Assembly symmetry: C3
Homo-oligomer: 108 residues x 3
Amino acid sequence: SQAIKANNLVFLSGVLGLIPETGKFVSESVEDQTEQVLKNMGEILKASGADYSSVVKTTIMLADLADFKTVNEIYAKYFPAPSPARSTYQVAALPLNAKIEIECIATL
Amino acid sequence: SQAIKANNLVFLSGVLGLIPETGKFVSESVEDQTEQVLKNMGEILKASGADYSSVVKTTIMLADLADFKTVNEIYAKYFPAPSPARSTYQVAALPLNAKIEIECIATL
Amino acid sequence: SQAIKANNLVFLSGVLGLIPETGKFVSESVEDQTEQVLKNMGEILKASGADYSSVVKTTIMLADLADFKTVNEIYAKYFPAPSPARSTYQVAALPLNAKIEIECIATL
């Protein structure tokens, strides 16, 4: 599932920068994918009765930490200060060769 | 500890594909290790008063994402749809050169 | 934020081995950084009304799993048995080229 509610909380799967409907990446660029991830996350959270403001913890998995400034810039637009708790790191690879995956936990 | 209950929830340590008793890998193959991980997880969850059906979130750490189809096939047997929330990624290395590590969170 | 309380629980961001005040690494060595991470974590937890003994789950992200014995030794001093649930793995890279990042979840 994309999200599981256990009841004070909701647990999101790691989100990729895919057009939900089609399962293809929005583009090859981390800049588009990051924003698509965040958009996708907002949809999943809202459907779940959560929202960006109820997120308590995120984890950002990157293909390349050199992308961090662009990623942070975009992320900060959806999660302005004070923002969720967060961890960030560069992994060896992501599913479907994605540039970025973000998972999160939110309150209901 | 292998698991900590905080009380609506239980938090599992990342599980490796070891024969619990002996601490040696079941084999070198991701196919055996994945299944051993899942078996080990079921034991830990049950001992804890949880079970596969109460798992809400998993994280699969892989040595090689090329293993994903085999891993998914096995995983899907223990976690049929609708399955827990889940993240998957390839790490640089795992403890003891394991092929796969899975952690999870479950309800009580 | 460094930590978010949702209320039975507190979620910590991944902690690096920086002198909090200055934002520079305590040193280049994993041995100093690991200990600084743990110290930093204790401060964040206490400020939050938690403490090392209320931590339920940690995740250790390493630059090099060859560092595991030194890391484990230090960690075990702050988290003696029975210790939190825990996952450990080697990532491709960490923010600011850190040697180690640890995140955690604790009870209040």
